[PDB]
Design a protein around this nucleic acid. Structure first.
Ligand SMILES: Nc1ncnc2c1ncn2[C@@H]1O[C@H](COP(=O)(O)OP(=O)(O)O)[C@@H](O)[C@H]1O
Ligand SMILES: Nc1ncnc2c1ncn2[C@@H]1O[C@H](COP(=O)(O)OP(=O)(O)O)[C@@H](O)[C@H]1O
Ligand SMILES: [Mg+2]
Ligand SMILES: [Mg+2]
Ligand SMILES: [Zn+2]
Ligand SMILES: [Zn+2]
Ligand SMILES: [Zn+2]
Ligand SMILES: [Zn+2]
Ligand SMILES: [Zn+2]
Ligand SMILES: [Zn+2]
Lengths: 186, 590, 590
RNA sequence: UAAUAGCUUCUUAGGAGAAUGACGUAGCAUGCUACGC
RNA sequence: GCGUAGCAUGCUACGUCAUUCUCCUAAGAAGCUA
């Protein structure tokens, strides 16, 4: 507003009007200067309206630009995170067993539900009570999915280590069921 | 995306879209770049174009934004305002942008086309964040320049070891060696894809190629060859990490019974282990290839990454480290595409080993204890920034002689780039001097080594040998044919075969030439193993023959002469054309 | 961001900007503090500066709350109103702030520079909240005094093991010992960035410092050092938890025939069990820290945390516990840097062990059943608040004596501090008396105790040994070399060296001297274990050589000399300076 | 760790519209007065 | 009677400001239901 010369025109018109009023100018000159001051102030506020629109749309454009830059610098982060997750999952794969079962496929296509069941090297058995434990994986080795597994660890629901001697019929009340047993393919 | 301005490092979100590299630019810096040069396109988080139904205005000094878009003057709303005003270009972080008056050289960096000599000389003395940008845009310019080339194909199936060449008409053809590789395109009917890369080399006569293959997939005529104008990634690491000294050697623990072979360099080994980065310039044939092995034997338990610009130097270093260093804890890292006949003698390609040898282009992002860069004359600033980005190590050692030949530097055609501005490291070696320098030359005869020390050097070289009395220098005319992109001297080989019968020594010689066409034709009529003047500089030989084809400023380049005549050890037949080149040196007349 | 007033614990949102610790103050208390002292800056949720375009007015009586911000006298919006008026200062919770009469001691605490002695006797006899605030601001002032130490630099390096030093001209030079560290600069053009953490110590010959670093960077001559700063954390817990007298032992359990050696202190163990906290005051070497281990043997199931202000005292306590307690259930907690070499014989740094020994500063937040603070003379109110905050407990036992040497108090340089103002615990001991008191020396021979019952204690101690006649008092002038800003007495060390080969049974006597410089430099010339008087407290040795370095008010301190001599177990040779001090004791001839 | 969808309350901001009032400018209509024909 | 100038009254258009209301959108807090 003050940068534009409309303020300068308003200020010089007001100064001339005040000077002539103090100097006792005639009524016709007084009305002439009043009209000139009125049109100068009219131009001043009219361009101040354009300045209001300028600053408003400039702030809106700046906020939009900040938001777009933020949403574009947050897209690259999630793209990199997804890429790292996918490549780590690639590196986790049991490549030889998966290659065997996928070359045995006629079309190259296999059900997903058999991918762990035939290639996973580690089995987690979650057991709710002692009778189930005795049924499924009693002893240090057991059979599941037509394979042989050897118990490598047992933990309780509290993620505390449990020894195979502590899983008994009388020590069952003292164990935080369920028990998660981790076994490796033999 | 936001980033840092190139010449003031303030936060910004603009970009000079007309530039090849599109560098970030702060507000005041972007205004100073656009009002001065002819780049009038600026890319913000959205491109600064005219978002009208029909109109296409790219200039930014003639764009006014309104509402939520940018239009020209014929499509703007009743509201204002200029995008490019008050000394600034409207972008993010408008009041954190500090101007800088180093745009007066950023204009010359961004707008030049590298045709003249001065572009390199002012693309190397600028600041660091412009040292990187100039190298990046130079590499981009070279890559785009290799896109205007004489695409070819194979005429028809001709041999299992050799193909033929059917080029297009009206376009130049590249040099042919292991450096220039070529790509086949399978646009057959049906879906252009890649089958494999072949490198090419001139044939015996007429039109033929004796090649080097990448993939076994044998094409019909359905493929045509281009020159793999690949992409250039941006570079971020500085050319040279800051020089910080250490009191006593850190992370490097000296050895027991290193050898009685190289025990005179123990002071230089420890001076290598002292600073952050060290510089060793050794005149041709003074043991820098052997100094690397000695350094590896002076700090026995430190993993060392050897690196070089080209396969020849790194392969010679690999062979020496096989001959001296322990062998099983070695690992040469080969490219997956295998554009060269690579080196398979070690337990190859295990990046988690101790002595890791590699090329600059194929370095994997890893860490080391002390990394030895070799042939810094060959390396451009891009290679230095790459080796600083991919490799983090406690010590860096740059070895190489700036008096040898520079990089190809294909774009340069007018004027001579003096050695000082080959790269940052050669500038260091000429400004203050190499930190280490070994001046006793162990390859050349007496007269040649004394005269080479008196040719350009400030008389600092000598030989621990006697002169073998089998180096010569003749003046035989050697009529020129030159009916190919380079000059050839066949009847000079005629004169040399008029000799070479009373001289049974060199009958296993390596042929060198100042022109790749004569080098290619010299391996055809007589099967001399060849090695170009560029492919030298890092290996030693005892039988080498070198002829001069022409007489010009490319024939009197004393850097090339010094890198040529210092690869033989006991015998060289050589052809001199100019009386200048017969009189700076002492040899028998015949 | 609201809080509680320091001296009335009303609700508030104001803080004093000029105060180092920036304490919360209610409206009435803040008005009383600012209208009387020179502090004239008040921080609310927003600071009370004047919000003109540019104006800097901070005095609160000048300002007004005008419009929506704080404005000065001739920048205010025409609508007022005054901030600092109506007997208050405008802040949150304005009509709930009850003042006090402690705005006469708080002015003195905030204003004082801790130079005189009366500041400490007013910082320890005030109310409980002021006891914490005064300790906090005292630690803050002790830390900010280090900011006035001269910036260093390096002269050169002839020897890489001994740095050369150069202090800035016109500033004081800090003392060279282990307690002070430094961090560097390289401000040339070119890296105004730190270059590592170093530390210094003087050399005997010429001007040199045999430095030490955390890394192995060398200093190009422009690189230099500045002493860093330790920010002081806020503290909340009371200095002493209020005492309650139980009818019977709660939370603790006796034992079955504790031992035949600890059978005398059973009544004091029961008294400890009865009360919330207990104080044990006794002359040195009477059974105070051998009372705590007996207490552990009397309450076997009780988890116990032993703590002390020093490291060499808690180390002696650890050794005694190893001699008595089961070694399996012990620990030792060390700080991350571990400036001193600590005790490594138990399972170090396991907080959840039954008996846990640590310094006050490195205490981890945990619980216990009784916490044993030892050598409360070394501890200030900050240490008491720290141990009362981090370690919850059921019973507290403070063992120590006021007549030993107090905490350093580096800022104090005028007058002397009486024992009853060392901290709150010593004040309790001297005012009403200790809860447990045992005067009978069980460690030192008859001669040294019969002399120390004349220096410090007014003929109170009988003791138990026989004077072995190996108590020696030497006459030697001892010329002065004020070298490291702590004196070194080379000829006295020479006297010792010339008469330590004449004493075949004194080859292992510990060397004690008040000055750390001579104490550290003696290691080369005689090779004995060395120890300063301040850290020797709490540890016993079979033989002691004490050397009064120079006559001063530091080495002729009766408390220091009494805590120095009484570490002997069978004999002690001491060389003295003061004609009075050598005469007040009754030792052998020489 | 926290789903899909519907409805409702409250608060803030922006735009558009409406209504009323106020000021200023321009255009048009009327009454009175001064000068010239 | 006409032209020029001035004052007063009225209507329309435009610009600015104050108040009230409606709606359209965005953002946030919350409640209930299936
Ligand atoms: N200590 C030494 N004594 C004698 N000859 C040496 C010694 N060290 C190196 N040399 C010889 O110097 C020559 C150096 O050439 P090279 O090993 O290719 O490295 P460069 O090309 O960097 O000089 C070698 O041929 C080697 O035989
Ligand atoms: N009941 C006792 N019987 C025999 N000797 C004791 C007895 N109590 C303590 N002592 C001896 O007295 C010394 C006192 O040591 P300490 O308690 O550390 O003294 P201080 O607490 O003053 O440092 C111990 O070294 C111990 O050998
Ligand atoms: Mg070499
Ligand atoms: Mg004790
Ligand atoms: Zn540009
Ligand atoms: Zn900039
Ligand atoms: Zn347009
Ligand atoms: Zn204050
Ligand atoms: Zn208060
Ligand atoms: Zn003001």
């Amino acid at each position: 507003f003050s940068s534009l010369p409309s303020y300068a025109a308003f200020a010089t018109a007001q100064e001339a009007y005040e000077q002539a009023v103090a100097n006792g100018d005639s009524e016709v000159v007084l009305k002439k200067l009043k009209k000139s001051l009125n049109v100068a102030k009219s131009e001043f506020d009219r361009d101040a309206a354009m300045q209001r629109k300028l600053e408003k749309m400039a702030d809106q454009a700046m906020t939009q630009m900040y938001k777009q830059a933020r949403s574009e610098d947050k897209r690259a982060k999630v793209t990199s995170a997804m890429q790292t997750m996918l490549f780590t999952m690639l590196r986790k794969l049991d490549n030889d067993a998966l290659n065997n079962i996928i070359n045995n496929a006629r079309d190259g296509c296999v059900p997903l539900n058999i991918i762990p069941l035939t290639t996973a090297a580690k089995l987690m058995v979650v057991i709710p009570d002692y009778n189930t434990y005795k049924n499924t994986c009693d002893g240090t080795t057991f059979t599941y999915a037509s394979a042989l597994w050897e118990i490598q660890q047992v933990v309780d629901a509290d993620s505390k280590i449990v020894q195979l001697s502590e899983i008994s019929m009388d020590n069952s009340p003292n164990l935080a069921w369920p028990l998660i047993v981790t076994a490796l393919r033999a | 995306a936001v980033g840092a301005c190139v010449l003031c490092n303030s936060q910004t979100s603009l970009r000079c879209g007309a530039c090849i590299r599109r560098p970030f630019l702060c507000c005041k810096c972007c205004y100073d770049h656009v009002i001065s040069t002819s780049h009038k396109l600026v890319l913000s988080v959205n491109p600064y174009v005219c978002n009208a139904p029909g109109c296409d205005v790219t200039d930014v000094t003639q764009l006014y934004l309104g509402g939520m878009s940018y239009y020209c003057k014929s499509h703007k709303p009743p509201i204002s305002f200029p995008l490019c005003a008050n000394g600034q270009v409207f972008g993010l972080y408008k009041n954190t942008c500090v101007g800088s008056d180093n745009v007066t050289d950023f204009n010359a960096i961004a707008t030049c086309d590298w045709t003249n000599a001065g572009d390199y000389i002012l693309a190397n003395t600028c600041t660091e964040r412009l040292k990187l940008f100039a190298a990046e845009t130079l590499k981009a310019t070279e890559e785009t320049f290799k896109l205007s080339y004489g695409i070819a194909t194979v005429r028809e199936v001709l041999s299992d070891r050799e193909l033929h060449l059917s080029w297009e008409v009206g376009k130049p053809r590249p040099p042919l060696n292991r450096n220039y590789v070529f790509t086949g395109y399978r646009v057959t009917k049906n879906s252009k894809v890649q089958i494999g890369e072949y490198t090419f080399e001139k044939g015996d006569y007429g039109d033929a190629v004796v090649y080097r293959g990448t993939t076994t997939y044998k094409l019909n005529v359905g493929d045509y060859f281009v020159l793999t104008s690949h992409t250039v990634m941006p570079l971020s690491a500085p050319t040279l990490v800051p020089q910080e000294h250490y009191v006593r050697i850190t992370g490097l623990y000296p050895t027991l019974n290193i050898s009685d072979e190289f025990s005179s360099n123990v002071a230089n080994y420890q001076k290598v282990g002292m600073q952050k980065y060290s510089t060793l310039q050794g005149p041709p044939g003074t043991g820098k290839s052997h100094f690397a092995i000695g350094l590896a034997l002076y700090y026995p338990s430190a993993r060392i990454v050897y690196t070089a610009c080209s396969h020849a130097a790194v392969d010679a270093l690999c062979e020496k480290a096989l001959k001296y260093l322990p062998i099983d804890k070695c690992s040469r890292i080969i490219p997956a595409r295998a554009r060269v006949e690579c080196f398979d003698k070690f337990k190859v390609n295990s990046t988690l080993e101790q002595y890791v040898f590699c090329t600059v282009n194929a370095l994997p992002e890893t860490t080391a204890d002390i990394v030895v860069f070799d042939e810094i004359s060959m390396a451009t600033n891009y290679d230095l920034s790459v080796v600083n980005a991919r490799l983090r190590a406690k010590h860096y050692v740059y070895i190489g002689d700036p008096a040898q030949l520079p990089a190809p530097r294909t774009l340069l055609t007018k004027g001579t780039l003096e050695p000082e501005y080959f790269n940052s490291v050669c500038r260091l070696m000429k400004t203050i001097g190499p930190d280490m320098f070994l001046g006793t030359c162990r390859r050349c005869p007496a007269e040649i080594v004394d005269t080479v020390s008196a040719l350009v050097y400030d008389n600092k070289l000598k030989a621990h040998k006697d002169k073998s009395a089998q180096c010569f220098k003749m003046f035989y005319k050697g009529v020129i044919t030159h009916d190919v992109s380079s000059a050839i001297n066949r009847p000079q080989i005629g004169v040399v075969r008029e000799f070479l019968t009373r001289n049974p020594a060199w009958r296993k010689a390596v042929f060198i030439s100042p022109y790749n066409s004569q080098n290619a034709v010299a391996s055809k009529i007589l099967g001399l193993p060849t090695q170009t003047v560029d492919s030298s500089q890092g290996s030693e030989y005892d039988y080498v023959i070198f002829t001069q084809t022409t007489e010009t400023a490319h024939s009197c380049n004393v850097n090339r002469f010094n890198v040529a005549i210092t690869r033989a050890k006991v015998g060289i037949l050589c052809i001199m054309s100019d009386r200048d080149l017969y009189d700076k040196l002492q040899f028998t007349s015949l």
